[PDB]
Structure formats: C-alpha cells, structure tokens
C-alpha cells in the first residue's frame, strides 16, 4: 500500500534556454550599463 504526494519547492533543475538581463554596479557607455539593474553589494553565493 502506497500513495502519492506533491511537493512544492523541490530542488530539481533542468538545463533550459532563458533570456538574461544585465546588472552592473553604479557617462554614456557603448554598453548601456546605465540601463542595467544595480546589483546588490553582497551577491548571494551558496555551495552545493
């Protein structure tokens, strides 16, 4: 006897296509960094 349960936020990933956006840290530059979203001072970094 067994039953099935659904789990939300399960650590599963699959390689996939995805659009990415620029983000810099704050003059007109040929790379439009003034339109980049400002980045956090301390980027999160998690070991696996």
């Amino acid at each position: 006897n067994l039953w099935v349960t659904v789990y939300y936020g399960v650590p599963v990933w699959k390689d996939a296509e995805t659009t990415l956006f620029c983000a810099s840290d704050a003059k007109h530059n040929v790379w439009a960094t003034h339109a980049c979203v400002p980045t956090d001072p301390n980027p999160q970094e998690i070991h696996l």
Binding site: K27, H28, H34
Partner: protein
C-alpha cells in the same frame, strides 16, 4: 571640473571690463531616460576678492535659459551672460571707480537641491586693476 579664465586686465576709471570664464566639456548633461544631451541646470557664480579683504558675491547665471541674478549693491552696472555654443561665461562690469580693482573668480555650482549654493570648482582668478 576644469575652469579656464581670461587674462589680467588693466583698465581705466569709467570704462567697461569683460572677463571670460571657460568650462570645457561641462555645460551639457546626459539624460539617461531620454538617451540625449541637454543643457545642464548648472549655475555659474561670479565672486570678487579685493587685496586682503574677504570674498564678495556678484551674481550667478543659470545656463539652462540664461536666467541671471545680480546682487543689490552692484545692480544696474554688471551683466552676466553665457554663450552655450562656445560653452563659456562672460562678465561685463561697467563704470568702474577706483574701488572695483580686485581679482575676479568664476565658480561652478551643480544646482542640486540638497546642496544649496555649493561651489565646486574655481578659476585661476583674473586681476582687474583700474588706475590713472
């Protein structure tokens, strides 16, 4: 910012003196939300320094539409203008008596609300001397 000034002036009483202050590559500002160059809201102030005395404020010009304002004491004989194409500022002081001899400074002001009447950069100073 860079601030080039004119040369020494040796004038005579009752004449007129024109002092040039150049601010290379400083007038225009860039608007990111518009992706274009506009005339900045900067202000150019004009100060004077008699030998040994304290600083004196003449007047300031807002370069956007050239809106000027002079002090009450010198009102009526001093005109401040600017040329945005050559990107410089002109002081025209007329009917100088023997008391107007001094050194005249042009000063830059970012005209940001949180910093009232802040003077960022200054010129070399022009020695205007009147005598007979």
């Amino acid at each position: 910012v860079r601030l080039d000034q004119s040369g020494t002036a040796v004038k005579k009483p009752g004449a007129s003196v024109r002092v040039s202050c150049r601010a290379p590559d400083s007038f225009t500002v860039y608007r990111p939300r518009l992706s274009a160059y506009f005339i900045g809201e900067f202000n150019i102030h004009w100060l004077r320094q008699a030998p040994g005395q304290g600083l004196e404020w003449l007047g300031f010009v807002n370069i956007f539409r050239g809106a000027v304002k002079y002090s009450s004491r010198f009102q009526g004989r001093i005109t401040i203008t600017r040329d945005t194409s050559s990107e410089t500022s002109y002081l025209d002081l007329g009917a100088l008596k023997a008391d107007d001899t001094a050194t005249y400074y042009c000063a830059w002001d970012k005209n940001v609300d949180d910093n009232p009447w802040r003077l960022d950069s200054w010129g070399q100073g022009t020695l205007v001397i009147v005598s007979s």
